[PDB]
Amino acid sequence: EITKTMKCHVVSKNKDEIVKLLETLETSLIIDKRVRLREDKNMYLTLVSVVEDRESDMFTTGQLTAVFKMIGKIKREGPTMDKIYGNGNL
């Protein structure tokens, strides 16, 4: 399991635009509860929690804090029993 608490900024001359952009971004992240890691679509980043702190600085800190997790699988393999054979005696 790989977890990342990724924070996001939104900059603009119009602060109301910052509020609107953060609102739509949060709503998108919530209603679509995961994100395509790559265009191949095999991987995904299931959301855990998205939180905004409007008081936080626009440039240094960043308004929106999101936590994503992903579950890898150890890439081990081995030979397979395609064919089985046996005889009978007494």
Partner: peptide, 8 residues
Amino acid sequence: IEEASFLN
């Protein structure tokens, strides 16, 4: 590292 999934 091949992917996996948890049924949320």
